[PDB]
Design a protein around this ligand. Structure first.
Ligand SMILES: O=C[C@H](O)[C@@H](O)[C@H](O)[C@H](O)COP(=O)(O)O
Ligand SMILES: [Mg+2]
Length: 467
């Protein structure tokens, strides 16, 4: 009942997914591929997972369905979503990642990959249609495929071999581990690159990290760790490690779209593709920016139409490298799905090459002061109603303070309100969980904080009133 596609992935409550649904959705997927002639009897399907409590069970159900359908499940254990996809795509095989990514800890999901990339919105519909048509099925777990570290090792080597052993010697970097599937990978990879890494804040409890809505606790932790004069940066990822979480030499967060810009510069990108929620200062630096709806499938579909490299990224910080990049005789092949290691390493490499701290690098882009947050536990019907309210000219004027007039409204993806002052407030329903997003831009830190608070209070009040 909670289980549906949305922005990307099939997601919903862990207690619903952990059972027949995970098995049946996996069956729908593989049978969808086989029907289309793309999967033949005995072909490999790679499965990976994150560190959510339900993830081992859900992976085992997925692997059961793969095998019952007549295909070969390959257990890749615990690893980043981009590691699984990089490896499976290199093997020309589909894959399934078990993760809820950023979503709350009572939820989980499945992220589906074809042999050549993320599933698209047509695929999502064909899976849902196939799922609907399945019989009333004998769900079965597969614990029997021994874990292979091949995918994690290949992924590590992608970066080690591209930058080269010892190429970042001199850096000292904190690794905020929490429950990131890359918590250990980052330690050994950084060490191989000549960085001195320091483990910080490992958690035996799953921590849902949303890089577009950091917990005040994580912000305070990054500041506290990063206030040491001993660290050049703190690096991390979210749960399934498709998004970076990067802080500078003072422990201040570098917003994901700025890490994305730093990465675009580093790889010498010709065209950038990013959603509408990315910082509006991007176009000031980069002359070819294609703006999209929010979500990886939208970014990928625009990247695919583009003929240096094509780079995609979102304000969540995930980077989608669209073209092979060359450097000092070494290649980094295209990986058109969100990655955290690329932006992390691009940021560290920039610091290393320019002998300049990350805060100065970040400031050099002159980004508008942006903030983002979300309200949790907001049903789809309630966020749909609120967003409709904002389409009424009278209602908009009623909800916002009179002194700053709304001069433009866009409904490309949610509702974005542009003000005469230059302020902007953007609301979106999350497609991945019952949450309402509020993103703002303003002219300085004080005004931005006030604007973020106002935007969230306006939504809170209107949501309570409509109830
Ligand atoms: O979130 C995960 C999405 O699939 C990702 O591609 C998207 O850009 C944002 O991280 C937020 O999307 P929502 O705001 O819809 O949750
Ligand atoms: Mg994620």
């Amino acid at each position: 009942n909670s289980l549906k596609f949305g922005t990307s992935g099939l997601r919903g409550l862990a207690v619903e997914l952990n059972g027949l649904p995970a098995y049946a959705y996996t069956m729908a997927f593989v049978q969808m591929l086989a029907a289309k002639g793309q999967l033949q009897k005995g072909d490999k399907v790679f499965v990976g997972r994150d560190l959510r409590p339900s993830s081992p069970d859900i992976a085992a159900l997925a692997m059961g369905a793969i095998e019952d359908a007549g295909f070969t499940p390959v257990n890749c254990g615990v690893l980043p979503t981009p590691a699984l996809s990089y490896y499976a795509m290199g093997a020309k095989a589909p894959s399934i990642m078990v993760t809820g990514s950023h979503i709350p800890d009572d939820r989980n999901g499945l992220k589906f990959y074809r042999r050549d990339g993320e599933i698209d919105k047509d695929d999502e519909a064909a899976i849902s249609a196939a799922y609907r048509k399945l019989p009333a099925l004998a769900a079965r777990k597969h614990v029997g495929s021994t874990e292979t570290d091949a995918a994690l090792q290949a992924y590590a080597d992608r970066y080690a071999g591209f930058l080269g052993k010892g190429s970042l010697n001199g850096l000292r970097v904190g690794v905020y581990q929490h429950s990131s599937v890359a918590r250990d990978l980052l330690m050994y990879l950084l060490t191989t690159l000549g960085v001195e890494p320091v483990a910080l804040g490992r958690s035996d409890i799953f921590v849902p990290v949303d890089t577009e809505a950091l917990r005040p606790e994580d912000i305070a932790l990054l500041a506290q760790w990063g206030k040491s004069d001993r660290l050049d940066a703190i690096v991390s990822t979210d749960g399934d490690a498709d998004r970076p979480l990067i802080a500078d030499e003072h422990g201040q967060f570098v917003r994901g779209d700025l890490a994305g810009a730093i990465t675009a510069t580093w790889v010498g990108a010709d065209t950038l593709v990013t959603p509408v929620t990315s910082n509006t200062a991007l176009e000031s630096r980069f002359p070819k920016v294609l703006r999209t709806r929010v979500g990886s499938p939208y970014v990928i579909a625009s990247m695919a139409q583009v003929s240096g490299p094509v780079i995609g990224f979102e304000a969540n910080g995930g980077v989608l490298l669209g073209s092979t990049v060359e450097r000092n005789g070494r290649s980094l092949t295209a990986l058109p799905t969100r990655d955290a290691l690329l932006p992390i390493l691009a940021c560290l490499a920039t610091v290393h090459e320019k002998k300049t701290p990350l805060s100065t690098i970040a400031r050099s882009y002159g980004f508008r002061v942006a903030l983002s947050d979300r309200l949790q536990n907001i049903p789809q019907e309630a966020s749909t109603a609120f967003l409709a309210l904002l389409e009424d000219a009278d209602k908009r004027a009623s909800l916002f303070p009179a002194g700053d007039a709304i001069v433009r409204v866009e409904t490309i993806d949610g509702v974005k309100l542009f003000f005469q002052s230059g302020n902007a407030v953007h609301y979106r329903a999350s497609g991945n969980a019952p949450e309402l997003r509020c993103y703002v831009e303003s002219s300085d830190d004080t005004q931005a904080a006030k604007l973020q608070a106002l935007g969230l209070e306006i939504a809170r009040k209107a949501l309570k009133d409509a109830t």
